[PDB]
């Protein structure tokens, strides 16, 4: 179950969850879209 841990908010995403749906929900609910992004490994 998702929770807004404070000590931001974190929500677990299922491996089978669609990327499009989760991205759309995140953009509509949390904050604006990103003109650029960097992923660090």
């Amino acid at each position: 179950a998702f929770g807004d841990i404070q000590f931001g908010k974190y929500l677990r995403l299922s491996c089978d969850t669609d990327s499009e749906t989760l991205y759309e929900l995140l953009t509509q609910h949390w904050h604006l879209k990103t003109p650029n992004l960097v992923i660090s490994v």
């Binding site: 179950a1 998702f2 929500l11 299922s14 969850t17 749906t21 989760l22 929900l25 609910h29």
Partner: peptide, 10 residues
């Protein structure tokens, strides 16, 4: 709402 969207995503 946000809770409903989270539940649907789950």
């Amino acid at each position: 709402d946000l809770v409903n969207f989270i539940q649907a995503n789950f």
